[PDB]
Amino acid sequence: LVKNKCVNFNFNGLTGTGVLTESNKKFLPFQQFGRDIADTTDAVRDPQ
Amino acid sequence: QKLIANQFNSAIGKIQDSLSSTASALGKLQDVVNQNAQALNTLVKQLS
Ligand SMILES: *[C@@H]1O[C@H](CO)[C@@H](O)[C@H](O)[C@H]1NC(C)=O
Numbered sequence: 001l002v003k004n005k006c007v008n009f010n011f012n013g014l015t016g017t018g019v020l021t022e023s024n025k026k027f028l029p030f031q032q033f034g035r036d037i038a039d040t041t042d043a044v045r046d047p048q
Numbered sequence: 049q050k051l052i053a054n055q056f057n058s059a060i061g062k063i064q065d066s067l068s069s070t071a072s073a074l075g076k077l078q079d080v081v082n083q084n085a086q087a088l089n090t091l092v093k094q095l096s
Contacts, residue, residue: 038092 001046011044 001009001020008017014033026034026043034043067073 038089039096040092 001048009044012047014041014044016041 003020003022006017006019009015009020023043028034028045032045033041036042
């Protein structure tokens with residue numbers, strides 16, 4: 001993975017393009033994805 | 049002159065206190081923001 005760059009990610013099937021950045025603020029106890037009020041993915045956990 | 053000045057100053061103080069105390073004194077402005085936010089949220093939610 002390359003961060004701080006407009007890439008075309010694919011984590012376990014889910015697609016999308018964007019800039020992947022460090023998100024140490026968000027805490028995922030056991031969940032996989034992330035979501036917003038407008039129901040859009042905003043943070044993903046790296047399977048690697 | 050003295051009485052009118054005192055009444056005016058007291059009225060200014062009273063309106064300042066009333067604005068600072070009550071919470072529902074600015075509905076006519078919050079309603080527009082809430083309506084626009086609702087419209088945008090519904091438009092985004094239509095994607096799914
Ligand atoms: C699992 O991921 C870690 C991450 O550093 C890596 O060190 C380790 O080698 C991986 N396991 C295997 C079996 O490759």
